[PDB]
Amino acid sequence: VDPTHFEKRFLKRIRDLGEGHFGKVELCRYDPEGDNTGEQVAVKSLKPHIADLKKEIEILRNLYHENIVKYKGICTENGIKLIMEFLPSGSLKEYLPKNKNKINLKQQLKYAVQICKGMDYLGSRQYVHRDLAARNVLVESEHQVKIGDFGLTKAIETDKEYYTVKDDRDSPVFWYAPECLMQSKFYIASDVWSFGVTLHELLTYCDSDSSPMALFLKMIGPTHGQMTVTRLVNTLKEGKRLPCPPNCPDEVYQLMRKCWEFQPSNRTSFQNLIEGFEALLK
Numbered sequence: 001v002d003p004t005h006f007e008k009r010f011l012k013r014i015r016d017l018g019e020g021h022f023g024k025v026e027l028c029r030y031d032p033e034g035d036n037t038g039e040q041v042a043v044k045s046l047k048p049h050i051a052d053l054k055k056e057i058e059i060l061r062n063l064y065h066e067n068i069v070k071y072k073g074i075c076t077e078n079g080i081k082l083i084m085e086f087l088p089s090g091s092l093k094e095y096l097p098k099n100k101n102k103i104n105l106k107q108q109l110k111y112a113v114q115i116c117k118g119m120d121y122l123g124s125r126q127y128v129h130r131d132l133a134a135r136n137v138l139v140e141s142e143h144q145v146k147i148g149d150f151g152l153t154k155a156i157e158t159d160k161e162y163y164t165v166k167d168d169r170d171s172p173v174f175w176y177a178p179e180c181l182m183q184s185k186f187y188i189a190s191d192v193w194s195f196g197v198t199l200h201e202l203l204t205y206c207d208s209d210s211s212p213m214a215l216f217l218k219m220i221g222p223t224h225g226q227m228t229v230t231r232l233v234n235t236l237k238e239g240k241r242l243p244c245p246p247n248c249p250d251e252v253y254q255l256m257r258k259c260w261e262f263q264p265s266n267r268t269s270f271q272n273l274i275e276g277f278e279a280l281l282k
């Protein structure tokens with residue numbers, strides 16, 4: 001009965017879609033007319049951290065892009081739910097293993113371009129994503145993907161180059177650049193690094209045995225507990241990186257390597273990546 005919001009009683013629950021840090025996402029049909037003509041929507045709620053969800057809502061409200069999941073609205077309870085468009089094929093992490101024979105290198109490069117476009121937009125808006133990994137890239141169809149979660153996303157202040165994180169507890173460390181691990185500083189160039197790791201996942205079709213975590217654990221050892229990040233940083237300082245996936249051509253690997261320069265100022269920009277991938281298409 002605020003017509004500008006979604007009524008909780010009409011978000012007809014269908015099934016779970018996924019879980020993240022603070023939240024879970026569920027598929028609902030929003031059916032206020034009660035005649036089953038309403039649309040299916042994805043609904044993010046706090047897990048069975050209110051301030052955190054509200055910050056994520058403010059970010060997604062402020063984003064509108066072809067390769068960013070579409071904000072639809074809010075449902076208010078105190079509590080709040082974030083309402084988004086539903087993207088039926090789910091994340092790249094679940095979609096790619098099911099579609100190896102359907103998705104070729106050409107299609108993978110088109111996804112790389114779409115990811116880089118959403119990311120260049122995000123950066124232009126002075127946000128750092130902080131969780132760019134295949135599990136957060138949603139597939140609308142065979143031909144299009146969108147960045148689909150913003151739970152760790154932060155604003156960089158005008159004229160500043162990084163955001164300093166005070167709370168690193170949710171951090172995907174095997175997707176993180178050295179400055180994020182060593183100083184909790186997050187630059188747009190730190191999201192470039194994460195994108196290189198995401199690209200690696202995309203090229204290995206998100207095989208679990210080739211995941212950045214599984215691969216780095218093999219390099220540094222799996223039982224270091226709280227010394228894990230320390231060993232990761234040591235490895236990176238030594239210049240080691242994830243290898244070229246087999247079936248990844250050298251020209252693509254070179255783009256990936258440009259995301260992995262140790263120093264953030266030495267890394268490629270997302271605009272340069274967009275153009276670099278497009279030169280490999282047709």
Ligand SMILES: C[C@@H]1CCN(C(=O)CC#N)C[C@@H]1N(C)c1ncnc2[nH]ccc12
Pocket residue numbers: 017018019020021022023024025042044069084085086087088090091135136137138148149
């Ligand atoms: C890949 C999407 C982003 C990460 N997901 C989370 O649940 C994060 C949390 N908490 C799953 C979600 N997912 C499977 C979706 N599946 C279908 N439509 C969706 N719209 C928005 C998300 C979404």
